[PDB]
């Protein structure tokens, strides 16, 4: 029993973290086979941060302008190229710790683990969701640029996020590992702001199912709702529309608990309309939305505590 905001074991990623310096600017890179991936902002200088032309900045660089440190050892850069907002530094040594890996671009609402790093050295691991407005609510300081987010499926690491920047609201924006930003953001310090965010409805429902699996049913009720009528309440409370696809995805959790998806929707509607009245669910006084249906199934038992 119990239900925690659980991250994936980070060891396979720890072995891939390096330090990249260009000039007086240092950040983290990701060393897989003989390629180091890092944010192209490493070639920025502290005064050309408003509107750098990276193609222009990069053509003025040579392989030896990039200093890559893998803990003890310096790695020799033997080639470099830019792909969207990331640099690919070819090095002369294949990382002997390279895991089985993929690059994946995730959808908003999906979760991942973040290995926060400074100067190529991991500091901590935590679980994130990609928000519907394509920010993440991370924990990041200067030097964390290049830290990566990932999922592990069996022993394959699916990298899905590389960290670039902090927006003025204190939330975070970054790219896939091909350098394409999530959201409308760009890697320059001009005025940019996150769009209005919403709550991830399918995740809130998954977490209510987690609560039931863990022996807690106080929020349930005898009612049901139609999908349309639920979504009319969802919109009022700044929740994402729930789709038939979401209903389908919540299928396994519905079957394990015996609570129809639309019945759980009726519970959520009541929670949205009444609040919790000083009660908690799985240790939270708020409706939690950073657990996917897959996360719940992964962490919870196949028995439901009847």
């Amino acid at each position: 029993s119990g239900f925690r905001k659980m991250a994936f074991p980070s060891g396979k990623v720890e072995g891939c973290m390096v330090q990249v310096t260009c000039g007086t600017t240092t950040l983290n890179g990701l060393w897989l086979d003989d390629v180091v991936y890092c944010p192209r902002a490493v070639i920025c200088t502290s005064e050309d941060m408003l509107n750098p032309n990276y193609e222009d900045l990069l053509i003025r660089k040579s392989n030896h302008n990039f200093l890559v440190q893998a803990g003890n050892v310096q790695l020799r850069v033997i080639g470099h190229s830019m792909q969207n907002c990331v640099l690919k530094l070819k090095v002369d040594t294949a990382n002997p710790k390279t895991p089985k890996y993929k690059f994946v671009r995730i959808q908003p609402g999906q979760t991942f683990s973040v290995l926060a790093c400074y100067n190529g050295s991991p500091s901590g691991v935590y679980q994130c969701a990609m928000r519907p407005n394509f920010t993440i609510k991370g924990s990041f300081l200067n030097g964390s640029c290049g830290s990566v987010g990932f999922n592990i499926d069996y022993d394959c690491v699916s990298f899905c996020y590389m960290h670039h920047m902090e927006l003025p609201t204190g939330v975070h924006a970054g790219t896939d590992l091909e350098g394409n930003f999530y959201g409308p953001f760009v890697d320059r310090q001009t005025a940019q702001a996150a769009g209005t965010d919403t709550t991830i409805t399918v995740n809130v429902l998954a977490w209510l199912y987690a609560a039931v699996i863990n022996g807690d049913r106080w929020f349930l009720n005898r009612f049901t709702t139609t999908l349309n009528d639920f979504n009319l309440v969802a919109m009022k409370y700044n929740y994402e529309p729930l789709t038939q696809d979401h209903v389908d995805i919540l299928g396994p959790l519905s079957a394990q608990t015996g609570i129809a998806v639309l019945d759980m929707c009726a519970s959520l509607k009541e929670l949205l309309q009444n609040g919790m009245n000083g009660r908690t669910i799985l240790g939270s006084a708020l409706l939690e939305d950073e657990f996917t249906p897959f996360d719940v199934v992964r962490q919870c038992s196949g028995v439901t505590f009847q």
Binding site: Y118, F140, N142, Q189, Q192
Partner: peptide, 8 residues
């Protein structure tokens, strides 16, 4: 303004 979180 947004901050690219490299270090100097």
């Amino acid at each position: 303004y947004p901050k690219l979180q490299s270090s100097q």
